Amino acid sequence: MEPLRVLELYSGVGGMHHALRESCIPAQVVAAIDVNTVANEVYKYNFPHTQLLAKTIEGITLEEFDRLSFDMILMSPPCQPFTRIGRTDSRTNSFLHILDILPRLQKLPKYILLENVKGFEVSSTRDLLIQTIENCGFQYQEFLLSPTSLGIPNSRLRYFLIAKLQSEPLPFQAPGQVLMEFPKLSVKMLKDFLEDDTDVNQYLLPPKSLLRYALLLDIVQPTCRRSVCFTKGYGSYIEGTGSVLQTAEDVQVENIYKSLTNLSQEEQITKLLILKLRYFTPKEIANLLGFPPEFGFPEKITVKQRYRLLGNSLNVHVVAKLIKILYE
Amino acid sequence: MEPLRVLELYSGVGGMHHALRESCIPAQVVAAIDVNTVANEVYKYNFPHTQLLAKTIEGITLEEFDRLSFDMILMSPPCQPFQGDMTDSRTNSFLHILDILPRLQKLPKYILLENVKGFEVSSTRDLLIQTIENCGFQYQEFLLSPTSLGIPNSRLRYFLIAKLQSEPLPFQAPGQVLMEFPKDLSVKMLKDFLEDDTDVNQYLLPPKSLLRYALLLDIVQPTCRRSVCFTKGYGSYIEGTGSVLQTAEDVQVENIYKSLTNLSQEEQITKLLILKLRYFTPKEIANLLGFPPEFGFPEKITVKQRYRLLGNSLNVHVVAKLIKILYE
Ligand SMILES: CCc1ccc(C(=O)NCC2(C(=O)N[C@@H](CC(=O)NCC(=O)NC)Cc3c[nH]c4ccccc34)CC2)cc1
Ligand SMILES: CCc1ccc(C(=O)NCC2(C(=O)N[C@@H](CC(=O)NCC(=O)NC)Cc3c[nH]c4ccccc34)CC2)cc1
């Protein structure tokens, strides 16, 4: 009788929208707003029947906002575009316009849920945002949660703020506190998130990369229940970007390591290849991020862009549970 | 106990040597080893009477390690700004260290290593631990940030302290990485780490960058008792590299935020300059890192080079306490 109209800011590749669906709450995306042409392509490919406003948030007038009549705002960080080799940030103005439009709306949205990076919870920008929603009478709670809490073998500590237009306090509210756990199963293995049709070749680490960074790598095996944070650089830079997968069981990493001693560069390359280390594929990162099994990219989107498009994405599973918590 | 001869691997700017002096333990550095020309100039400038071997660790033979007759190994991550021979020396150096340890005529009694967080779950750590266990060392790993000693800087790093002895360490937690020092410390303000000589200009934030990233910034005031991790990119890349300092006072950050609303680019740029945001100086970062007041660079070192040389540096104060804990 009362389906929620949802506004998705910085829709990117549609992580929020996907979280909306997994929450199984009565809602629908009335509008997606993002200027990234490559991201929007990914968005249409997975959400063809959803309106996508390819505009900056600052360029969307209050009249348009009132017309959309949204009851829920969902926003996650903007996709970091591969700058055209020749080589603008509307973020400050877009964020200010959001703060400026909210009090002037004809219908305040009942729900607000924002996902940002860790560290935001101490910024001056947070204090101004919190200040505005308090003036508008939102009861809120901030979180810092990693998908490991929901049993996903992937570290991705991110910031969350859930806001609800109600006078009463929230049942789980810790005033002035960032909660580190969901309000009151285990960590699955990585093999559950691996695509079995993936070309193991092509994704195998190149030999010169193995030679230089072999012992600086974080090598995980498929039975491992852990993996490090993925950044936009995965697949192009090797240090600090993510874990790599050893697709050659019954070979012990520490044995390859010790046997490299007193070997030539060529013999080490030959030895390290035995481990059959490979990158996680873009689709496999999306699995760990919680994108639905049906999620995919247009073929025109390069592998490099796919890693980049996912590097800054939210975790659909973590956001989906908070949506449920927020909706009761 | 008689005077301890200390070996400093990947000396860099000499954080390990500065920590040894702050430990106030009977020891001196008989050999500093690093191949970075820039870093070694800084090392010579501060420690002119210390032997500095500008060679790769893999290149130092066993007899020369035996002839050095060291009782303590201190190793810190290489300066990592990234020698004619084309060869990454990291792998062969680390494996060379492991292959030399058992073959030494004198095992060092003390071993202290500092590394980045995340190392404690690597296959490399496992091979390292295995080797020191088989050599008879008693060890304990830590993950400590300078805030545990009252320093207003976040910088979680990995530490391994090893000691050649039969008895276990009084604080030894087998199979655990301790997050506190084994059992004044009130976190001090950033005032006590700033330099009065510092030209507030020169380091002031430029207008172009203060317009794109103004609200993406972690702006800290001198009365604050906190700051984020500094990285090599600081002073060049704004986002994620470190906090920026607000020198103009009695001005409240959030007001300047709201006043950017509906203003033009040039009009916004003008309101933000009021905040008088400057970078932390390379020296000021060294103060937060714990380098002694006497620590300085040669003038020929560019400010850009000074920033990179400190990005991956250890914290002298935290290491110094562990050196004491180890010597007992
Ligand atoms: C140093 C720590 C810090 C401080 C501030 C911010 C931030 O966000 N200041 C607002 C901003 C924006 O437009 N922010 C964007 C997101 C963004 O840029 N994240 C950083 C990033 O991806 N860097 C590569 C919109 C947004 C999405 N979820 C949110 C939840 C709450 C408030 C705002 C948001 C004008 C610049 C971030 C980090
Ligand atoms: C992903 C997690 C991870 C895994 C491995 C390592 C590492 O260390 N693999 C050894 C090695 C090296 O050369 N290690 C260097 C340190 C280094 O490069 N750290 C990474 C960095 O600074 N990234 C910006 C020397 C060193 C100093 N303290 C130590 C304590 C124990 C063992 C080794 C060391 C190739 C031979 C680091 C992190």
XYZ file of C-alpha atoms and ligand atoms in Angstrom:
732
model
C 0.000 0.000 0.000
C 2.941 2.329 0.757
C 6.045 1.453 -1.289
C 9.020 3.682 -0.522
C 10.411 5.996 -3.208
C 14.215 5.838 -3.016
C 16.735 8.424 -4.241
C 20.187 7.018 -5.035
C 22.958 9.638 -5.007
C 26.251 8.795 -6.715
C 24.713 5.575 -8.022
C 27.933 4.552 -9.756
C 27.677 0.829 -10.480
C 24.556 0.452 -8.324
C 25.771 -0.986 -5.020
C 23.130 0.876 -3.017
C 20.358 -0.226 -5.386
C 21.529 -3.829 -5.068
C 21.525 -3.474 -1.287
C 17.985 -2.113 -1.532
C 16.847 -5.294 -3.268
C 18.613 -7.669 -0.899
C 16.970 -5.953 2.073
C 13.644 -7.107 0.617
C 12.000 -3.945 1.939
C 9.098 -2.322 0.084
C 10.979 0.313 -1.908
C 12.112 1.270 -5.389
C 14.725 3.566 -6.912
C 12.877 6.557 -8.330
C 16.085 8.176 -9.547
C 19.791 7.501 -9.889
C 22.171 10.465 -10.083
C 25.728 10.140 -11.362
C 27.831 11.887 -14.013
C 30.281 9.016 -14.629
C 29.564 7.837 -18.176
C 31.387 4.520 -17.712
C 29.703 3.785 -14.381
C 26.288 4.684 -15.787
C 26.838 2.160 -18.577
C 27.382 -0.521 -15.930
C 24.271 0.771 -14.149
C 21.977 0.501 -17.184
C 23.375 -2.929 -18.061
C 22.197 -4.219 -14.674
C 19.249 -1.819 -14.121
C 17.700 -1.043 -17.522
C 14.242 -0.043 -16.260
C 15.501 2.449 -13.643
C 15.673 6.162 -14.367
C 19.268 7.402 -14.237
C 19.812 11.170 -14.017
C 23.219 11.780 -15.610
C 23.586 15.112 -13.827
C 25.601 16.535 -10.980
C 23.739 16.799 -7.691
C 24.359 20.556 -7.658
C 22.659 20.890 -11.063
C 19.418 19.291 -9.885
C 16.970 21.978 -8.788
C 14.759 21.887 -5.692
C 11.741 21.647 -7.997
C 13.133 18.413 -9.430
C 13.860 17.124 -5.909
C 10.330 17.875 -4.701
C 8.866 16.263 -7.835
C 10.736 13.011 -7.178
C 9.005 12.842 -3.763
C 11.646 10.543 -2.314
C 11.172 8.906 1.092
C 14.714 7.481 1.251
C 18.188 8.767 0.397
C 20.999 6.311 -0.276
C 24.478 7.621 -1.059
C 27.906 6.010 -1.357
C 31.226 7.507 -2.452
C 31.630 8.522 -6.135
C 33.365 6.177 -8.584
C 36.929 7.360 -9.199
C 37.132 7.931 -12.954
C 40.140 6.909 -15.009
C 41.192 10.392 -16.100
C 41.417 10.647 -19.875
C 45.186 10.752 -20.440
C 44.824 14.372 -21.549
C 42.922 15.204 -18.343
C 36.633 18.276 -12.222
C 35.416 17.842 -8.635
C 31.880 19.073 -8.105
C 31.851 17.268 -4.759
C 32.039 20.305 -2.468
C 29.211 22.066 -4.319
C 27.201 18.847 -4.687
C 27.514 18.085 -0.969
C 26.560 21.643 -0.044
C 23.530 21.515 -2.357
C 22.362 18.364 -0.583
C 22.640 20.126 2.781
C 20.906 23.179 1.291
C 18.009 21.291 -0.321
C 17.054 19.062 2.628
C 15.467 21.690 4.932
C 13.640 23.240 1.944
C 12.002 20.018 0.715
C 8.217 19.784 0.821
C 8.481 16.227 2.203
C 11.518 15.312 4.253
C 12.622 11.756 3.435
C 11.868 9.400 6.305
C 15.096 7.447 5.781
C 18.723 8.396 5.157
C 21.605 5.927 4.795
C 25.121 7.020 3.826
C 28.216 4.901 3.262
C 31.657 6.524 3.268
C 35.267 5.559 3.969
C 36.696 5.012 7.426
C 38.157 8.179 8.916
C 35.172 10.301 7.912
C 33.705 9.934 11.418
C 36.224 12.456 12.838
C 36.144 15.082 10.080
C 34.701 18.559 10.354
C 32.519 17.672 7.366
C 30.835 14.969 9.446
C 30.018 17.455 12.206
C 28.298 19.774 9.715
C 26.326 16.903 8.173
C 25.304 15.529 11.571
C 24.371 19.081 12.563
C 22.021 19.491 9.596
C 20.114 16.227 10.056
C 19.722 16.976 13.763
C 18.155 20.327 12.866
C 15.778 18.423 10.577
C 15.015 16.056 13.475
C 16.650 12.815 12.326
C 17.587 10.160 14.852
C 20.844 8.698 13.580
C 23.557 6.205 14.435
C 27.065 5.896 12.995
C 28.798 2.562 12.398
C 32.212 1.221 11.412
C 31.678 -2.288 10.030
C 33.656 -4.744 7.912
C 32.015 -7.499 5.796
C 33.796 -9.957 8.104
C 31.081 -9.308 10.687
C 28.526 -10.856 8.308
C 30.790 -13.839 7.607
C 32.377 -12.568 4.362
C 36.139 -13.401 4.106
C 37.141 -9.854 3.188
C 38.333 -6.900 5.250
C 36.622 -3.675 4.199
C 36.108 -1.365 7.166
C 33.732 1.372 6.066
C 31.678 4.164 7.602
C 27.886 4.094 7.886
C 25.261 6.589 9.050
C 21.588 5.591 9.308
C 19.027 8.346 9.858
C 15.287 8.089 10.486
C 12.739 10.920 10.749
C 11.264 10.150 14.156
C 11.209 11.962 17.500
C 11.796 8.891 19.667
C 15.362 7.627 20.208
C 16.641 4.644 18.270
C 16.466 1.284 20.092
C 20.191 0.702 19.460
C 21.321 4.318 19.800
C 24.688 4.990 21.440
C 24.688 8.807 21.507
C 27.947 10.404 20.439
C 29.411 6.974 19.685
C 30.482 5.095 16.563
C 29.260 1.521 17.004
C 31.620 -1.240 15.867
C 29.049 -4.068 15.694
C 25.545 -4.602 14.368
C 22.923 -4.292 17.127
C 22.153 -7.632 18.759
C 27.001 -17.209 10.219
C 30.780 -17.540 10.644
C 33.447 -16.496 8.135
C 32.978 -18.518 4.946
C 35.884 -19.681 2.803
C 36.988 -17.850 -0.326
C 36.131 -20.788 -2.619
C 32.441 -19.950 -2.138
C 33.062 -16.554 -3.799
C 35.311 -17.728 -6.656
C 34.027 -18.025 -10.208
C 34.756 -21.535 -11.460
C 34.476 -20.558 -15.143
C 37.234 -17.950 -14.787
C 40.131 -18.276 -17.217
C 42.928 -19.119 -14.739
C 45.379 -17.934 -17.364
C 45.182 -14.250 -18.288
C 44.626 -13.653 -14.573
C 47.869 -15.395 -13.595
C 50.389 -12.920 -12.225
C 52.949 -11.953 -14.888
C 56.421 -13.385 -14.313
C 58.309 -10.118 -13.750
C 55.726 -9.220 -11.089
C 56.324 -12.494 -9.248
C 60.091 -11.924 -9.294
C 59.945 -8.468 -7.686
C 56.978 -8.667 -5.295
C 56.738 -12.404 -4.539
C 57.715 -12.124 -0.864
C 55.877 -8.794 -0.424
C 52.605 -10.393 -1.582
C 49.641 -11.435 0.547
C 48.976 -14.898 -0.897
C 45.672 -16.497 0.149
C 44.540 -19.986 -0.740
C 40.962 -20.932 -1.665
C 40.313 -22.598 1.700
C 41.453 -19.447 3.538
C 38.770 -17.494 5.407
C 40.380 -14.055 5.004
C 41.492 -11.452 2.475
C 42.740 -7.859 2.617
C 41.068 -4.660 1.446
C 40.713 -4.157 -2.305
C 41.661 -0.739 -3.698
C 41.146 0.823 -7.123
C 44.742 -0.088 -8.020
C 44.236 -3.854 -7.997
C 45.498 -5.382 -11.236
C 47.693 -2.371 -12.083
C 49.635 -1.879 -8.851
C 50.576 -4.788 -6.610
C 51.422 -3.302 -3.189
C 48.553 -2.316 -0.900
C 45.872 -3.116 -3.495
C 44.671 -6.563 -2.401
C 45.456 -10.233 -1.943
C 46.389 -12.690 -4.691
C 45.147 -16.260 -4.969
C 47.264 -19.421 -5.113
C 45.456 -21.754 -7.533
C 47.945 -24.630 -7.062
C 47.142 -26.747 -4.012
C 49.576 -29.238 -2.429
C 52.325 -26.652 -3.050
C 53.379 -24.841 0.121
C 54.161 -21.136 -0.287
C 56.862 -21.240 2.388
C 58.581 -24.042 0.456
C 58.710 -22.025 -2.770
C 60.013 -19.127 -0.658
C 62.865 -21.012 1.007
C 63.857 -22.706 -2.254
C 64.368 -19.330 -3.951
C 67.534 -18.915 -1.872
C 70.791 -18.919 -3.840
C 68.924 -19.133 -7.161
C 69.238 -16.967 -10.246
C 66.527 -14.583 -11.412
C 65.432 -16.982 -14.165
C 65.333 -20.031 -11.876
C 63.296 -18.090 -9.307
C 60.752 -17.085 -11.962
C 60.473 -20.754 -12.917
C 60.023 -21.744 -9.268
C 57.473 -19.058 -8.359
C 55.310 -19.945 -11.367
C 54.627 -23.303 -9.688
C 52.428 -21.533 -7.138
C 50.066 -20.503 -9.955
C 49.273 -17.224 -8.222
C 46.444 -15.329 -9.913
C 44.510 -12.121 -9.386
C 40.936 -12.194 -8.206
C 38.801 -11.304 -11.216
C 36.531 -8.236 -11.284
C 33.455 -10.461 -11.015
C 35.000 -12.298 -8.060
C 35.651 -9.021 -6.226
C 31.997 -8.158 -6.906
C 30.929 -11.458 -5.332
C 32.941 -10.634 -2.198
C 31.414 -7.144 -2.259
C 27.984 -8.800 -2.315
C 26.806 -7.954 -5.815
C 24.152 -10.434 -6.962
C 25.130 -13.530 -8.968
C 23.356 -11.847 -11.897
C 25.649 -8.794 -11.737
C 27.908 -8.285 -14.745
C 29.699 -5.754 -16.904
C 29.238 -4.740 -20.541
C 31.997 -6.265 -22.648
C 33.088 -2.782 -23.760
C 34.242 -2.126 -20.167
C 37.921 -3.003 -19.896
C 39.213 -5.232 -17.108
C 41.250 -2.298 -15.783
C 38.116 -0.165 -15.486
C 36.269 -3.038 -13.783
C 38.866 -3.198 -11.002
C 38.813 0.597 -10.784
C 35.008 0.750 -10.776
C 34.853 -1.731 -7.888
C 37.817 -0.403 -5.910
C 35.740 2.242 -4.110
C 32.428 0.334 -3.995
C 30.382 -0.264 -0.863
C 29.616 -3.761 0.421
C 26.081 -4.654 -0.702
C 25.622 -7.243 2.063
C 26.579 -4.864 4.891
C 24.429 -2.045 3.509
C 21.480 -4.387 2.943
C 21.379 -5.476 6.589
C 21.496 -1.876 7.814
C 18.576 -1.011 5.519
C 16.603 -3.779 7.249
C 17.678 -2.518 10.680
C 16.642 1.002 9.695
C 13.262 -0.124 8.332
C 12.475 -2.313 11.374
C 76.470 -6.612 30.531
C 79.343 -5.685 28.211
C 78.825 -3.256 25.303
C 76.450 -4.516 22.612
C 77.432 -4.230 18.950
C 74.347 -3.365 16.874
C 73.743 -3.968 13.159
C 71.285 -1.611 11.444
C 69.769 -3.017 8.249
C 67.926 -0.682 5.870
C 69.224 2.209 7.967
C 67.529 4.871 5.848
C 67.328 8.107 7.813
C 68.457 6.287 10.970
C 65.256 5.859 12.990
C 66.608 2.632 14.481
C 69.850 4.321 15.528
C 67.898 7.210 17.067
C 65.722 4.728 18.931
C 68.766 2.870 20.238
C 70.113 6.109 21.710
C 66.773 6.865 23.346
C 66.691 3.351 24.834
C 69.743 4.371 26.848
C 71.102 0.837 26.726
C 74.785 -0.147 26.552
C 75.102 -0.416 22.770
C 76.546 1.237 19.673
C 76.007 0.719 15.944
C 79.012 -0.915 14.287
C 77.524 -1.063 10.775
C 74.652 0.650 8.994
C 73.597 -0.951 5.730
C 71.513 0.687 2.992
C 71.856 1.391 -0.733
C 69.713 4.564 -0.958
C 72.093 7.431 -1.763
C 69.632 10.092 -0.614
C 68.870 8.381 2.683
C 72.556 7.744 3.388
C 73.297 11.456 3.061
C 70.758 12.090 5.810
C 72.330 9.257 7.795
C 75.854 10.665 7.431
C 74.620 14.154 8.332
C 73.274 12.997 11.708
C 75.662 10.098 12.461
C 79.014 11.126 10.926
C 81.047 8.697 13.055
C 79.003 5.570 12.241
C 80.154 3.056 9.626
C 77.669 3.096 6.736
C 77.864 0.239 4.210
C 76.170 1.373 0.988
C 75.773 -2.215 -0.166
C 72.955 -4.703 -0.551
C 72.457 -7.145 2.297
C 72.757 -9.979 -0.220
C 76.210 -8.635 -1.076
C 77.666 -8.818 2.416
C 79.385 -12.184 2.836
C 79.190 -14.408 5.913
C 82.807 -13.778 6.935
C 82.081 -10.054 6.840
C 78.965 -10.631 8.962
C 81.095 -12.792 11.266
C 83.785 -10.098 11.328
C 81.168 -7.499 12.268
C 80.413 -9.589 15.389
C 77.013 -8.030 16.095
C 74.894 -8.865 19.152
C 71.738 -7.048 17.995
C 69.901 -6.754 14.666
C 67.691 -3.727 14.063
C 65.766 -3.680 10.793
C 63.203 -1.190 9.489
C 61.334 -1.033 6.174
C 63.339 0.541 3.309
C 62.518 4.210 2.550
C 60.535 2.835 -0.392
C 60.751 5.656 -2.898
C 61.451 2.658 -5.168
C 72.679 0.476 -8.229
C 73.353 -0.229 -11.898
C 72.671 -3.964 -11.787
C 69.030 -4.611 -12.730
C 67.760 -6.687 -9.801
C 65.299 -6.234 -6.960
C 67.458 -7.032 -3.959
C 64.645 -7.426 -1.425
C 64.041 -11.151 -1.934
C 67.686 -12.250 -2.028
C 68.517 -9.942 0.883
C 65.797 -11.317 3.169
C 66.598 -14.920 2.246
C 70.304 -14.133 2.683
C 69.627 -12.929 6.222
C 67.773 -16.151 7.012
C 70.529 -18.303 5.498
C 73.255 -16.430 7.407
C 71.667 -16.562 10.887
C 72.306 -20.282 11.607
C 75.751 -20.125 9.987
C 76.993 -17.198 12.119
C 79.844 -17.910 14.518
C 77.900 -15.839 17.070
C 74.122 -15.712 17.050
C 72.934 -12.206 17.940
C 71.323 -12.240 21.377
C 68.753 -9.596 20.439
C 66.600 -9.084 17.356
C 64.100 -6.259 16.846
C 62.234 -5.735 13.566
C 59.688 -3.092 12.570
C 57.328 -3.551 9.608
C 53.983 -2.320 8.281
C 50.702 -3.637 9.640
C 49.414 -6.679 7.803
C 52.775 -8.447 7.768
C 51.701 -10.530 10.771
C 49.477 -12.744 8.555
C 51.848 -13.167 5.599
C 53.483 -16.348 4.392
C 56.726 -14.383 4.725
C 56.258 -13.864 8.472
C 55.701 -17.617 8.821
C 59.040 -18.404 7.168
C 60.669 -15.708 9.311
C 59.175 -17.016 12.573
C 60.124 -20.577 11.622
C 63.758 -19.572 11.149
C 64.096 -17.703 14.439
C 62.267 -20.479 16.310
C 64.686 -23.090 14.957
C 67.594 -20.846 16.024
C 66.417 -20.821 19.654
C 65.032 -17.292 19.931
C 62.175 -16.370 22.242
C 59.962 -13.886 20.426
C 56.788 -11.817 20.663
C 55.034 -9.751 17.991
C 53.213 -6.462 18.551
C 50.973 -4.014 16.704
C 51.469 -0.624 18.360
C 50.646 2.995 17.443
C 52.413 6.098 18.842
C 49.186 7.080 20.624
C 49.852 4.362 23.221
C 52.789 6.538 24.384
C 50.830 9.806 24.373
C 51.937 10.955 20.899
C 49.067 12.564 18.892
C 49.645 10.550 15.713
C 48.053 7.380 14.380
C 50.654 5.013 12.987
C 49.962 1.344 13.685
C 52.999 -0.739 12.779
C 54.274 -4.290 13.241
C 57.073 -5.144 15.666
C 58.918 -8.378 16.381
C 61.228 -8.547 19.403
C 63.392 -11.656 19.751
C 65.798 -12.722 22.474
C 68.221 -15.663 22.532
C 67.494 -17.367 25.843
C 66.045 -20.536 27.359
C 63.291 -18.993 29.488
C 60.153 -17.534 27.871
C 59.553 -13.805 27.891
C 57.551 -12.687 30.953
C 54.897 -11.193 28.651
C 55.060 -13.880 25.963
C 51.623 -14.674 24.502
C 52.298 -17.602 22.142
C 50.266 -17.333 18.963
C 49.002 -13.826 19.726
C 49.936 -10.339 18.528
C 49.776 -8.009 21.524
C 48.066 -4.636 21.072
C 49.459 -2.929 24.200
C 52.859 -2.420 25.756
C 53.535 -5.034 28.467
C 52.402 -3.825 31.884
C 52.418 10.927 31.336
C 50.832 8.674 28.712
C 47.928 11.126 28.354
C 47.826 11.972 24.652
C 49.588 15.306 24.227
C 48.566 18.188 22.000
C 50.097 18.857 18.607
C 51.400 22.210 19.884
C 54.312 20.399 21.573
C 55.437 18.991 18.186
C 55.203 22.093 15.970
C 58.236 24.204 15.060
C 58.313 27.906 15.918
C 60.818 28.677 13.160
C 58.392 27.230 10.591
C 57.472 29.735 7.910
C 53.667 29.462 7.931
C 53.812 30.632 4.332
C 55.651 28.360 1.889
C 53.845 25.461 3.577
C 50.431 27.161 3.360
C 47.927 25.212 1.275
C 47.678 26.552 -2.310
C 44.322 27.864 -3.558
C 43.730 25.331 -6.346
C 44.119 22.336 -4.038
C 42.289 24.060 -1.174
C 39.272 24.343 -3.520
C 39.091 20.761 -4.816
C 39.767 18.930 -1.537
C 38.722 21.453 1.136
C 35.881 19.325 2.510
C 37.715 16.052 1.824
C 40.363 17.128 4.345
C 41.149 16.107 7.912
C 41.768 19.587 9.319
C 43.508 19.562 12.706
C 44.029 22.489 15.070
C 47.054 22.888 17.390
C 44.947 22.209 20.513
C 43.843 18.843 19.076
C 45.390 15.624 20.345
C 45.184 13.457 17.209
C 46.262 13.149 13.572
C 46.145 10.557 10.798
C 48.882 8.388 9.339
C 51.446 10.249 7.237
C 52.443 8.735 3.890
C 55.119 9.325 1.253
C 52.559 11.151 -0.903
C 52.047 13.880 1.686
C 52.599 17.372 0.328
C 51.954 16.112 -3.224
C 48.777 14.002 -3.159
C 46.269 15.510 -0.760
C 43.783 12.698 -0.121
C 44.755 9.898 2.265
C 48.301 11.205 2.762
C 47.896 13.075 6.047
C 46.119 15.746 8.034
C 46.530 19.441 7.245
C 47.041 22.063 9.953
C 44.793 25.072 10.562
C 46.881 27.994 11.832
C 44.310 30.806 11.781
C 42.338 30.556 15.009
C 39.120 31.748 16.622
C 37.723 30.852 13.193
C 35.448 27.813 13.334
C 35.950 25.353 10.475
C 32.275 24.541 9.939
C 31.303 28.192 9.425
C 33.622 28.503 6.416
C 31.995 25.314 5.127
C 28.462 26.749 5.169
C 29.625 30.077 3.704
C 30.892 28.369 0.537
C 27.243 27.724 -0.339
C 26.131 29.209 -3.668
C 29.404 31.136 -3.932
C 31.518 31.036 -7.080
C 34.812 29.181 -7.455
C 36.933 32.296 -6.933
C 34.669 33.516 -4.124
C 34.910 30.119 -2.416
C 38.708 30.081 -2.797
C 38.790 33.394 -0.959
C 36.751 32.292 2.064
C 38.878 29.165 2.524
C 42.228 30.990 2.578
C 40.955 32.547 5.810
C 41.494 29.221 7.573
C 45.234 29.551 6.836
C 45.759 25.819 6.304
C 49.387 24.725 6.112
C 51.024 21.358 5.707
C 53.001 19.878 8.545
C 56.653 20.501 7.771
C 58.994 17.566 7.094
C 60.713 18.357 10.395
C 57.422 18.574 12.297
C 56.546 15.105 11.020
C 59.940 13.920 12.296
C 59.071 15.411 15.685
C 55.814 13.452 15.700
C 57.889 10.452 14.592
C 60.072 10.976 17.662
C 63.334 11.969 15.999
C 65.490 13.885 18.483
C 65.485 17.699 18.412
C 68.952 17.501 16.861
C 67.603 15.594 13.838
C 67.798 17.533 10.581
C 68.389 17.131 6.859
C 71.173 18.377 4.613
C 70.010 21.490 2.805
C 70.523 19.802 -0.578
C 67.598 17.508 0.287
C 64.472 18.895 -1.358
C 61.328 19.221 0.741
C 59.718 16.690 -1.597
C 62.549 14.221 -0.941
C 62.286 14.906 2.795
C 58.583 13.990 2.706
C 59.096 10.692 0.879
C 62.005 9.758 3.150
C 59.740 9.970 6.212
C 56.564 8.427 4.753
C 57.575 4.838 5.528
C 59.659 5.657 8.626
C 59.262 3.925 11.988
C 58.419 5.784 15.207
C 61.567 6.268 17.294
C 59.665 6.511 20.582
C 57.714 3.253 20.248
C 60.760 1.295 19.112
C 62.865 2.766 21.909
C 60.499 1.446 24.582
C 60.593 -2.044 23.044
C 64.402 -1.942 22.932
C 64.322 -1.278 26.685
C 61.738 -4.016 27.256
C 63.974 -6.414 25.339
C 67.228 -5.580 27.149
C 65.334 -5.702 30.463
C 39.740 12.827 5.608
C 38.457 12.089 5.918
C 37.256 12.509 5.120
C 36.624 13.736 5.312
C 35.511 14.116 4.562
C 34.953 13.271 3.592
C 33.754 13.683 2.769
O 33.065 12.839 2.237
N 33.423 15.056 2.606
C 32.275 15.558 1.834
C 32.501 15.666 0.296
C 31.914 14.601 -0.605
O 31.393 14.961 -1.662
N 31.953 13.245 -0.269
C 31.392 12.130 -1.072
C 32.182 10.778 -0.723
C 33.710 10.874 -0.805
O 34.260 11.676 -1.517
N 34.477 9.962 0.009
C 35.962 9.990 -0.043
C 36.603 9.326 -1.227
O 36.007 8.486 -1.880
N 37.912 9.722 -1.565
C 38.674 9.150 -2.727
C 29.833 11.967 -0.796
C 29.413 11.056 0.314
C 29.163 9.708 0.166
N 28.811 9.144 1.392
C 28.833 10.144 2.355
C 28.542 10.032 3.730
C 28.640 11.169 4.485
C 29.017 12.389 3.888
C 29.299 12.488 2.535
C 29.214 11.356 1.715
C 32.515 17.092 -0.252
C 33.798 16.302 -0.192
C 35.607 12.050 3.387
C 36.719 11.680 4.139
C 51.232 -7.723 2.502
C 51.904 -7.949 3.827
C 53.402 -8.035 3.805
C 54.067 -9.197 3.444
C 55.448 -9.276 3.421
C 56.257 -8.189 3.765
C 57.765 -8.301 3.764
O 58.422 -7.599 4.498
N 58.419 -9.263 2.957
C 59.863 -9.511 2.951
C 60.761 -8.711 1.973
C 61.271 -7.338 2.391
O 62.098 -6.802 1.661
N 60.877 -6.679 3.560
C 61.379 -5.355 3.996
C 60.171 -4.503 4.506
C 59.130 -4.046 3.479
O 59.400 -3.854 2.323
N 57.796 -3.863 3.960
C 56.694 -3.416 3.083
C 56.540 -1.880 2.860
O 57.268 -1.072 3.389
N 55.515 -1.478 1.979
C 55.238 -0.058 1.645
C 62.459 -5.530 5.141
C 61.961 -5.701 6.535
C 61.960 -4.709 7.501
N 61.405 -5.198 8.700
C 61.053 -6.525 8.505
C 60.467 -7.409 9.426
C 60.192 -8.683 8.995
C 60.500 -9.067 7.672
C 61.080 -8.188 6.769
C 61.380 -6.877 7.158
C 60.804 -9.073 0.488
C 61.869 -9.602 1.401
C 55.592 -7.025 4.129
C 54.194 -6.952 4.145
